[PDB]
């Protein structure tokens, strides 16, 4: 079961190229797309080696890199051009589909800010139209700017069956622990975030051998399909889980969790892991929903020997509804500040519904 990636816009193409850089270096694959001599199941992201990428000015910079052998601004301006070359790009997807044994999903890497915003909106609809049987995960990035962001939500709220990365919170981590004041620097964390996000897929393990094996635990209902991330190493398991849940480490700018996933990429002794949960549960350090039975997920891995304990956490927190409000709050200010202008109005409605669904989810009686 192979998963192909899709990169749009400036942000998407820049981080995806670096996403591969971290990925190819994680394995023994030289920049010229060949294995170096110097276990790790590489079928999901590579074909026989060649990566299953579909990329869409900046391509010159990539073609000038040593990796040459590895292969408008309004939402209306973006959506218009995408319809025109619809059949052009869908040839690439089709030829890559049947060339794959059993296609499983469609990772999408783009920023909601400009061509990637509209083109991604066009893609997600058309992707669901032709393919109804394929998971669609997206690595969307958050920041006339508000209008582009709200339109993408309307598509992301019903099409993408499954992460958020906000620059303002990411940039704050830069001045604190990295002292940058640069995109090429803040993107480095994204690569570490993205690569660690899919560690259990490439290394053969007992479970979590498919994208469905990961996300299906978090999303309880197709309306609550948003996640947030956490990464501690910037050394027992208890040391890790404590440092994850601190609000200073998460990548976000009453409220409670729905489900938590823990990714451990170290060589820690696995006898004490059930002990940390005991002490952590007693500390009652994190609150949870009272309606649905769920728990905290923890999964091990192994670090690349060709490259010490790390740790990443996947979170589905109802506090993410706060971020949406800011976009909607700003837009309402714009609607009173300046061919039908109704598509924005319908989206305005559907995004408001999601805010209520999260707010209703923290109730003892969210169901019905």
């Amino acid at each position: 079961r192979e998963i192909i990636t899709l990169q749009l816009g400036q942000c998407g193409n820049q981080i995806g190229f670096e996403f591969w850089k971290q990925l190819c270096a994680e394995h023994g694959i030289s920049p010229e797309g060949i294995v170096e001599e110097f276990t790790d199941r590489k079928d999901v992201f590579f074909y026989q080696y060649i990566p299953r990428a579909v990329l869409l000015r900046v391509i010159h910079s990539i073609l000038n890199s040593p990796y040459a052998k590895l292969y408008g601004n309004n939402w209306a301006s973006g959506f218009s051009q995408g319809e025109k070359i619809h059949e052009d790009i869908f040839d690439i997807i089709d030829r890559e589909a049947d060339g794959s044994d059993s296609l499983e999903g469609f990772v999408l890497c783009h920023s909601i800010a400009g061509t990637g915003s509209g083109l991604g909106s066009y893609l997600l609809e058309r992707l669901n139209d032709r393919y109804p049987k394929k998971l669609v995960q997206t690595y969307s990035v958050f920041p006339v700017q508000p209008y582009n962001s709200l339109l993408t939500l309307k598509r992301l709220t019903q099409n993408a069956d499954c992460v958020v990365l906000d620059n303002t919170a990411l940039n704050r981590i830069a001045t604190d622990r990295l002292h940058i004041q640069s995109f090429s620097q803040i993107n480095q964390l994204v690569s570490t975030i993205m690569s660690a996000s899919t560690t259990t897929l490439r290394y053969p393990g007992y479970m979590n051998n498919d994208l469905i094996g990961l996300i299906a635990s978090l999303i309880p209902t197709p309306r609550l399909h948003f996640l947030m991330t956490g990464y501690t190493p910037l050394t027992t398991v208890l040391d890790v889980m404590r440092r994850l849940l601190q609000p200073k480490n998460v990548m976000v700018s009453n409220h409670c969790y729905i489900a938590i996933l823990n990714i451990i990429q170290g060589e820690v002794d696995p006898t004490q892991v059930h002990k940390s949960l005991q002490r952590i549960r007693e500390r009652k350090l994190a609150n949870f929903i009272p309606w649905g039975p769920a728990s905290i997920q923890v999964a091990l891995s192994r670090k690349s020997p060709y490259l010490r304990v790390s740790g990443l956490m996947m979170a589905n927190h109802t506090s993410i509804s706060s971020l949406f409000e800011r976009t909607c709050r700003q837009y309402d200010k714009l609607r009173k500040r300046e061919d039908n202008f109704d598509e924005m109005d319908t989206s305005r409605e559907i995004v408001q519904q999601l805010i209520d669904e999260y707010h209703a989810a923290t109730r003892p009686d969210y169901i019905s």
Partner: protein, 78 residues
């Protein structure tokens, strides 16, 4: 728990139980109207009964297991 007969003869009922439910959802594409709902409420009267039945069994080694299921004290309300 392969040697522990009581738990191994109760969870076993949970095993083949999902086969029936998963088939029920896959054996059609419409709403559960043609005696599916009539078949749906059959298992929940047994499953939820089998659910809390297991709960009394664990109340040496189960401490590592029951802790995970009881992280949100949901079965405490059962």
């Amino acid at each position: 728990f392969i040697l522990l007969k009581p738990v191994f003869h109760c969870l076993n009922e949970i095993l083949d139980l999902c086969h029936s439910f998963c088939s029920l959802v896959s054996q059609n594409l419409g709403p559960l109207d043609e005696r599916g709902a009539a078949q749906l409420s059959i298992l929940v009267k047994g499953f939820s009964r089998q659910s809390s039945l297991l709960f009394k069994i664990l109340s040496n080694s189960d401490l590592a297991q029951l802790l995970l299921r009881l992280d949100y004290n949901k079965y405490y309300t059962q």
